[PDB]
Amino acid sequence: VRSLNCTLRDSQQKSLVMSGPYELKALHLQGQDMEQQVVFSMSFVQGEESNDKIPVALGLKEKNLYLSCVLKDDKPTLQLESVDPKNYPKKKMEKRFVFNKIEINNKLEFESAQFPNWYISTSQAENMPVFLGGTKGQDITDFTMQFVS
């Protein structure tokens, strides 16, 4: 499986950082604190694809953790899920790990492959969790990607 290392920023230009072991949060970041931003390994996985819709998994660089979409208290929910490090990343990632990376107007949306029309989202307010949202409103669902060495 092929992977690229990257960071993500939402379209309000908030960076993503760890909020405890199994949550991300989004905040405006610049300067020295830049290094606290999460580096992803974006893997290009099996699934239905088009010019503008590319299935990916989002693992945390050199951690056995992946963003995962599951029902929690009966709602689609974003979580950070641990995996066996000897078996990941792999080309046939389980559906809960797969996001359709969609380019629209020079930005990126990450739709859950498991839960159609639910998206990786951030709040307008600073220091709030990254979450799975079913509305494209006040919540932000557009991102840019930055390549890292």
Q: Would you tell me which residues interact with ligand SX2 (CB under 6 A)?
A: 9, 103, 106-108, 144-147
Cα separation values, 1 from 9, 31, 70, 132, Å: 25, 34, 23, 26
Closest separation between CB of residue 128 and ligand SX2, Å?
Answer: 20
6 or 60: whose CB is closer to ligand SX2? 6
Backbone angles phi, psi at 42, to 5 degrees: -90, 115
17 or 145: whose CB is closer to ligand SX2? 145
Q: What is the DSSP letter of 95?
A: G
83 or 108: whose CB is closer to ligand SX2? 108
60 or 145: whose CB is closer to ligand SX2? 145
83 or 99: whose CB is closer to ligand SX2? 99
Closest separation between CB of residue 147 and ligand SX2, Å?
Answer: 5
Closest separation between CB of residue 145 and ligand SX2, Å?
Answer: 4
DSSP 15-69: EEEE-STT-EEEE---GGGGGGBPPEEEEE-SS---SSEEEEEEEETTSSEEEEE
Chain-centroid distance of CA 138 in Å reads 19
In angstroms, the CA 42 to CA 18 distance is: 17
Which one-letter amino acid corresponds to residue 78?
L
The residue number with the shortest CB distance to ligand SX2 is 144
Closest separation between CB of residue 12 and ligand SX2, Å?
Answer: 11
Closest separation between CB of residue 8 and ligand SX2, Å?
Answer: 8
